[PDB]
From Swiss-Prot, chains A, B:
Protein name in the entry: 3C-like protease
Catalytic residues in the record: H31 (for 3clpro activity), E55 (for 3clpro activity), C132 (for 3clpro activity)
Location of the Peptidase C37 domain: 2-174
Residues of the full protein shown: 1101 to 1281 of 1789
Catalyzed reactions per annotation: Endopeptidase with a preference for cleavage when the P1 position is occupied by Glu-|-Xaa and the P1' position is occupied by Gly-|-Yaa
UniProt activity-regulation remark: Inhibited by the chemical compound K36/GC376, which covalently binds to the nucleophilic cysteine residue. Inhibited by various macrocyclic inhibitors.
Role according to the record: Processes the polyprotein. 3CLpro-RdRp is first released by autocleavage, then all other proteins are cleaved. May cleave host polyadenylate-binding protein thereby inhibiting cellular translation.
Subunit structure: Homodimer. Monomer; in solution.
Native organism: Norovirus (strain Human/NoV/United States/Norwalk/1968/GI) (Hu/NV/NV/1968/US)
Amino acid sequence: SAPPTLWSRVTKFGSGWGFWVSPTVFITTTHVVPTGVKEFFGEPLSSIAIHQAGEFTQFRFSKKMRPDLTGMVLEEGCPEGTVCSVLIKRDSGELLPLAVRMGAIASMRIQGRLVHGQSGMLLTLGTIPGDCGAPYVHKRGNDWVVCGVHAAATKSGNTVVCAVQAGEGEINFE
Amino acid sequence: SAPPTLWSRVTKFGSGWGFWVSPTVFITTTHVVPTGVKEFFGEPLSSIAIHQAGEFTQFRFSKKMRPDLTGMVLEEGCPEGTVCSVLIKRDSGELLPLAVRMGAIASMRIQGRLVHGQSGMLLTLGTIPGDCGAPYVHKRGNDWVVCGVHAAATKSGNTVVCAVQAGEGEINFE
């Protein structure tokens, strides 16, 4: 079970959520990012290094925004076959950690677009519209690491997709 | 473990393999299908109903080619999260059943192309060039069913991709 400080990194943001990886680094899902604003968390956009790759968005602020936090490992994608936890917060405040077995990084057709991400199968009460941005995490030893942020899910809800940093690894026909 | 008759359905074909689903139906991987020939298994192409969808190829012959076989269930894709077996035959005759936990149906970038298929993670000695066409199977009760045919694999070999019948199911941003 995630400690309270880990949950405290999960942060309401735009139409979804985001995650404080460190005092200065915040990750979220591209499509939830508020548009037509001049600031994020009170900081002018120009003072922020905003990196975006498909559905994966990262902010690095020039000042410490969460100095209470230690830096956490951000993996480029979740270990295939690993059971990760999606740290879902609901608007009510309810915490809903969901266990998901991670699959492959690939592109999924989502509402007309081919979206690069990583799929997983819900093991656990699933994800719902508004959950986008919630972090996918797992433990390595006594530490938690984050590997993706929630983006989408199948109609049944049994399959979820998170945005990741990793690109398209080498696959060959056999 | 698969019975000898199940293995007997796995059939050398072109640059890979194919699988007899029934006395008249044979499935294989599109890219292994021999080109510039007039017959398959001694039957004129015109007497064959050849169906192709991406890397999934199916033949239905107009005569019984394997009357020794009972019809087997062909699933449109493998159950996500299920441990399937890839029934690999090697050119030497060696049988190499590999256990693979199946992931999501999606598109993978493979040598420049976005290829529709289903990925899985090798659990078990992996797949090698020449294995394409080998069936992905699992048991339901006392029966075996087939759900895909081998197409490709990552450089590490830890991730494999089979061609399937199923199309792109509904996914929505959350």
